[model samples]
Structures are given as C-alpha cells and as structure tokens.
Target: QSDFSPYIEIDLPSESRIQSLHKSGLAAQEWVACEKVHGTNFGIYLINQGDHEVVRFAKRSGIMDPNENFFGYHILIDEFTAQIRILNDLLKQKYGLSRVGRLVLNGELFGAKYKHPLVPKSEKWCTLPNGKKFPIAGVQIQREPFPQYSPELHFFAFDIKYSVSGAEEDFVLLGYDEFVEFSSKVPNLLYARALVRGTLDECLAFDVENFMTPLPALLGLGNYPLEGNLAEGVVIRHVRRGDPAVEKHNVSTIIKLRCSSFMEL
Candidate 1:
C-alpha cells in the first residue's frame, strides 16, 4: 500500500510580492487578498488509482522554525495522514467518487494561545467536500514550551484540499486569487483572507514583517491566527497552472523577508 511517490523539490519563487498597477481610480489589477493565519505549516496529498486511494501529508519544518522550537519531521505528517485516512474511508463509503486524484490540503496548525476566534479547539482539521459528511479526526497535543514553561497550545486547520489536477508537480503553491477561488467551493475549508487597505508597498511590507516574526508574537498580539500564515512567507511561483518540468518551473525564484519582532523565538 506504499504508493507514496518521492516528493520532487522543484525550485519555486519563495516570497515575491505582486504589485497592483493602476492609473488613478480604476480598480487595481494583479492584487490578491486572503486572511493570514498564524500557525505551523501542514499539507496533505491524495492520489486515487481506480478504486484504490493513497494519501500523504507534509509540514513546513526548519523553513519556519524561527528559534527552532519543534524540529520533528514526522510529527505533522504522521498525525495528519492518519486523520485523513480515517476520514477518507468514511467519505468513500458515502460519496461514490470513482477516483480522487492528487487532492492537497494545506493550512496552519493552531493551538490555545495562538487560537483563532472561529475555532477554539487546541487541534482541528478541515477540508472542502461538496455535500459529503466526511467525518475528520482531530487529536490534541500537549504544549511544552522551552525554558520549562507550559504554554497552552491547540491545533486548528485553515485550509482543505479537494480535487486538484497538478498538485505534486508544484507542491501546491497557489497565488492569492486562485487560492480564493479554490477555497470558495468548499466553504468549510478555512483559508486565510486578510483585510488589507493600503498601497502595494505597504501591503508587501506587512507581509515581509509577518514572515520574519514567529507565530507567537503575531498571534499573541491579536493580529491573526497562525493557521493562515503562509510558509514563513508566500512562495511566488510563475506557473499559475500545469506541472511543467523542473526548468519550466524554475522561471521564478524564492524571496525571504523578516517580521517586525522575534519575540516568540
């Protein structure tokens, strides 16, 4: 049953800001918006072959570890894949989809101190399915902060994957507008949409700062939950659609920006 394929780490534009070009009063084009969640990065992959299905999960590791809080590669992947398997079986029995290929679920894993107003649970999972009662499992993990400090940490999911065509190719790096459209179909999937009102430079600056600072400072200050936080920062890729080869995918690059403070670290 190990149909898991090796993940191809294609070079993608890590953090690049999209500018809105407008004359004067006309609506700005090339600008996308979403509510930024503050939490750990988690992603789920599903590949359906005929009547059989295979699912996998991944979490952002050293990439997001500011002060190196947690560095276990298997923590997020193991737990999330287990939860999805249990839920997928229930879904298969209910909805008779012949094949569910390459469905990806990406979001932030949130807890108590960094909890969002919507979901107060310490741990939560969500996905986008059309009118299907696919029950999901949420397991809680005890929070043990550094310095022998016991902080309240819970898990809350902000993104859910449905039917996606070319996910494995690009690792599901979506732009602001496309992501919004995709999340709209499955309303239950908690995708982050931020209320930004300012110039493009101002917005980009805000994003850069948010990425630099760790989850605690952003969430503790009541800015936004970490669940919607992009991986340290947004990965801006040139290929909006389709999974081209490595060279084609490399048309873009990665950008790294820092946040205002490094308190949580």
Candidate 2:
C-alpha cells in the first residue's frame, strides 16, 4: 500500500557524509521538494523471494530492529511509492529472472492504517514564543528516503496559527518582523514561509488557480468552516520550474509548497 513518492530529502545535520552547503546563505522560507506513497511517514521496504514477485510494504516485519532483513538487503531507503531506478534495479537483481509477488502489499499496504510520520515522539516536541507546545513532526530536514539529501539543495519547514476577534472572523496575520525574530530562535530555519495574507479576492483566486483543498475553511473566507482546525500560524512560498534558482538548490526541479490545505491531501 505504501508507494514511493519522489522526494529528495534535505541534508543538514546528518543523513549522510556531506554537511549541508546551503546553510551558509539559504533563508528559512525555502524547502527541498518532497512527497510519498500510500500511508504517510511509515518506512517502506522492498523484498523478493526466489518465487520472484517483488514485495513492497511498510512494517510487515520488525521495523524497529536495525538488523531485520526481510527485504533481501536490496531496499536502501526507508519510505517510498514506486521505485524502478537503475540502481534500485541493480541492487535488487537476483541471479535468476524475477517475477513480482503475491504476498506483500496484497491488500491495502501493510502500514496503510496510519498517517503520522515515522519520527519518535521523544524528539518531536518544541515550544513557541507564546509558550505554545507542539511537535516538529515534519519540520526537520530529515526524510524517509534512505536518510539521504542533496548537497545542492536547501529546505525549511514551519507552521502558522489562526486567530479571530469577537466573531470567528476572516483574520490571521503574523507580522513579518515578528516572524523573523520568531524564526531566528528556531535552529535551521530557512526564510520560512511567512503567514500568507490575502484579501478575500486573492484567497478565492488562489483557490481557483490552485488545487481545491479547502483553504477557504482554514482562511476564514466568507462563512467557511475550519473543520475545527487550527491555522498553526504560518504563510507560504514560490518556485519556477527549469529555473536554476529553484532547481539546483533542490538538487533538481522538485519543489515544496506551504499552506498545504489548498491542495490534495
């Protein structure tokens, strides 16, 4: 069920041998492009027995065991969708001709029951200036695709919160300067997406041009509802394909977007 999405993880602290080169000049708002398969955040493993069927799954075995070798030692990543790369094929090449499988991912993928990321709860929490406590689930440069990242790209992540006056009004604005200082205290923040401020018209136009994921509910446009959600208090980003400014930094043309509610979940 867990398919592999194309995502080049951001390497800052240590996913590999290289130290992050982008840190010297990158802003907090930037982010390396990322995505994934069926269930969210669970590690995906690829396996094959002599019978030949390729088996892809999340946690059909003891996931916490570092030595668990159910996947034929060919799987080099932690999460995925569909991988047919040359190196991936080579790593998985058995002496005999291979035929895919019937045992793995036979139904909805094994880890299909969940959606939260794979990070441990111990390292996931952080505090905000307002004494707000929340988990940094996906905020780190770390990712599931083999703990590897590009030396040429830079990435960042942060959240925004929504606020209202007397009535639940169309409102929410985290000032730029305040956010700058707010981001400063947080380590490794690249010019993180500022709180997206848009007039009702801008918001609607944005919704139309963008995928309809229902930010109107989150942005408080008209009488829209939040589905009882929190803005988490943040803004968004920009990028252009084929442009070096957006490409090389991501080590490729992959890009990331903020205020995700505006697109498919």
Candidate 3:
C-alpha cells in the first residue's frame, strides 16, 4: 500500500513535453521549484496508538526491519531520535489527545557518508583528469550538495502523509504549501529549498538552457558537488491541490529539471 512507502517519484521532464506545457499558458496553475538534493529516498512512519507510538523507517522497498543495517537506517535512530519525539508530540497536539493514526514523512537522506545504493559498483577502474585511477563505486558519494552539513548525514523532507486505519478518505497527502507550513512547526525538520514560484515557463527559464552552469545550492554554504557552487537540479511541482481539473493526484503534478553536467555523472 502507499502508506507502507509514501515516497513519491518525481518525473524528469522531456524537452518537447515541457515546451508543450509552457505553450499551454498554465498561468492559473501555480508551481514551485525546489532544490533537488541527490540522496537516497527515505521515509519515517509514525503510528500512534492510544497508549503508545510505533515508529518505522523505510526505503523505496518497504518498511525495514528495526535492525536493518543498510543505508542510513541507523542514523535515523542515533541522531534523529530527538526529532522523532518532537514529531510525535506535535502530531498528538494536532490530531487530538488520543493521537490514534499514522503519519509518514518522505525525505532525502544525504551527506558525505551517503552512497546511492542503487548505483552499481563499477566493473573497471576509471582514470581521472588528475591521472589517478580509482573504481567508480556505487555512483558518486553525496558530498557536494551541503558542505556545511558535512560529516553528518541529514534529511530534507519533501512530502508528508497522514492516515487512519479504516478511514481511507482521511488518508491524504498534505498539499505542498501546507507541508511547507507544517514542517516549519517541527524543530529540526528541514524542508527542501524552494528556488522559484510561478508559471511553468517562468520556472523553466531559471535553468533549462543554463544547466551547464548549475546554480548554488539553496541550502548550506551553497558549494561542492561537481566542484563549487552547484546543485543537482530543481524539482517543480504544480502547488495547487484538491482540484481534479489541475491534477489527478498531487504526486502526479511533480517533475524535475536537472543540470546537464550532473546528468553525465
């Protein structure tokens, strides 16, 4: 079920498709472009019982075993324990004193220590411009996006979901603006950085052709990755929600525009 893994995949826009969208003059359709941090997709599920609460961490696969030693599962336990408590308390305050239901937060777990597990290990050694040879193992280490957040892995929440066991209609995703507002209330909950807000063409103008020259990351010192002053890309979402004429699902309204150089990596 979606509750098991609420992580939404953002689509990469094609040149022709985006141009087509731009021509549609989707002016009434507002949008937001947020910095696309390159990291492993992760989620945290908080289920509140009347007497106690249960928390589970997951990747794209599904809910992971408590002792799962892969990826940044342990980091969630070690450093984010305090944040978990804050979230639990906040949910209880918002929902009711009973606090019965579940909440899922979808985010990107990234930092110098993060290695994209989906990227397979290199079959052969690759030589660099410096005349040094090394195996390109498991894609690039996610080190450049946020140098200030170095040494320690961090999370940036992009989406949130809440649901009651039987009330399927109550199970709904928080709209983009609503998520931005809610996440701010939870201390230490870092939301993705918004780069622009306007029509599709206005946002596309921010980078499409200049992807070769990536802009500085909106968070942290804004340096690193390919070299200095570069971010992976921007994730654009049609911010309005609850209107069937605008989008079938809020998740379906999201797409990504990436840097050309980063694409090569």
Candidate 4:
C-alpha cells in the first residue's frame, strides 16, 4: 500500500458490519495511532512514534468536501439525530471539529485524541469558496497560522493528460515529466499536485452534501472532461507546508483521490 492508503484496520465489508462496530464498542477503541492522510476519503496510518504500518482505518470523508444539500455538511457521519454514528460521535465529542479536523489533524490530532489538524494555510483554505465563487455557510473552521500558506495564496491552473497505454485492468502512469511540465507553468512550482485522482471514467467534481451542488477548485479545474476538459482534469503538484520541502521544490501529492479503482502502474 502507498503511504496514503484508505484501508481502515477493521475489516468491514458491509454497512451492517460498519453499524455494529460502535454498538459493540469496538469502533471507539483507541486505534494504533500512526500518520494520517486526507482526501475524498480520510485515512489514518497505524504506525506511529517510530514507524508506519499496513493497518489503517479509512472511510468516506466529508471535510473539504464540495457536495452539500444547499451548502456543506462538514461531518462525514451525520452530526445530530436519534443515534449518531461511531466516528462522528468521536470527532464531535473529542475534537472541537466535526469532520474536516479529523481529516488533516496534526500528530497531536487536536488532543481530541491529540486535538489538532495541521492544515496548511488554514486561514486561506477556510475562506476558499466552492466552485460557484460565493461565500459558503455552515463551515465554521478557525484559522491557525503556520509556516506557510496561512494568510494569502494564489492558485495556478494546469491541464494534464493520463495516457492509458493499457486497459484499466492493466495500469496507467502519469509520468513525472507530465507533472513537472504543468508545474513549471504555474504561479510558482505550485503547491497542488495530485490534488484529484481518477480513472478515465471518473469525475473530479467535489460532491457537496446533496450530490447536486459541487465544491471544486482545490485543483483549479471545472466539472468534467465532458466540459471539453480535453484531459482528466487539473491537479496541483506541490508539497503542503510543514513538509521538509520549504524554499525547496519537491513532488508530492497534497490531497488524494476518492476511487476504489486504483492500479499500481
């Protein structure tokens, strides 16, 4: 598995199984804390203190998610109802956040377990509008200052191509040069590579709560290639702040894609 895999530790294969973990109090158990990666689905590594591991816990993520009923929901598992889901219950009761916080927390993880999500340039990310360019409501994330991307930022746009030399059954690789070429044209090398990942059949629009309204632009692109996108879509190719590559340039994926169809090319 890649450093950013979404396979949660619990081997859940059905919705009934997912619903029962919390009932049995197993879902709430303190999992082996490792590293965390964020995206369409959120993931936590089971290796901490001195390493990484194959064990993990991943689920559909709702943070930074664009899909919404009228706006955004901010929580993966619904917040309030008769019975709240297990993960949502933990995120709400533990961390001050609902879902977004869980996705990008620092190693401390807000001490909720460790309360905090070290969002790079949080102030700016918080203020970013959905694809429509209007102010969004229901999102009340507080902005914290970090080494970079805190206050001001500019997003770069680039069109990319993923030539599938073989069928989806085989694999396809978007070469490094293809990435660097687009980065070279960005505002600076750009802090937004691999922002969105998908197959030729997948779409990159960030679905809000309703699956009707869209939340996009984290990669600075439109809805789909059907919009004459010409290629899969755009992706930001730069490391996030706090990464070792400060004043230095490196190729790293900021956000991950939400797909069940991934191949090791």
Instruction: Give per-model TM-scores.
Output: 0.43, 0.22, 0.70, 0.21
Query: How displaced is residue 243 in candidate 4, in Å?
Result: 24
Q: Once superposed on the true structure, which residue ranges of model 1 sit more than 4 Å away at CA?
A: 1-38, 60-100, 114-175, 194-202, 207-256
> Considering every candidate listed, which one attains the maximal lDDT?
3
The alpha-carbon lDDT assigned to residue 219 of candidate 3 equals 30
Q: Which lDDT values do the candidates have, in the order given? A: 0.38, 0.27, 0.60, 0.24
Judged by lDDT relative to the true structure, which candidate is superior, 1 or 4?
Answer: 1
Q: What is the C-alpha lDDT profile of model 1 across 1-265, one tens digit per residue? A: 2322332232322232221122221123222223333445655566666567665545553123212223222334455566556444444454464444555556655433323454343332332222222112232232322111012332334443344333344334444455555555443344455444333333444454444224344344435434433233332222222223322533322222333232244
Worst 10 residues of 3 by lDDT: 212-221
CA lDDT for candidate 4: 0.24
Maximum-TM-score candidate: 3
lDDT of 3 by residue, 1-265 (tens): 4347546666787765566555554434788888776778888777766567777788778887665544433534543556666765675577674554777778877653322243223344434334445443323445443322333456778877676661445666777787787788777778875678887666666774344222223333233443333456788877764345554422356678777656665
Q: For model 2, what is the C-alpha lDDT against the true structure?
A: 0.27
How many backbone clashes does every candidate have? 32, 31, 1, 29
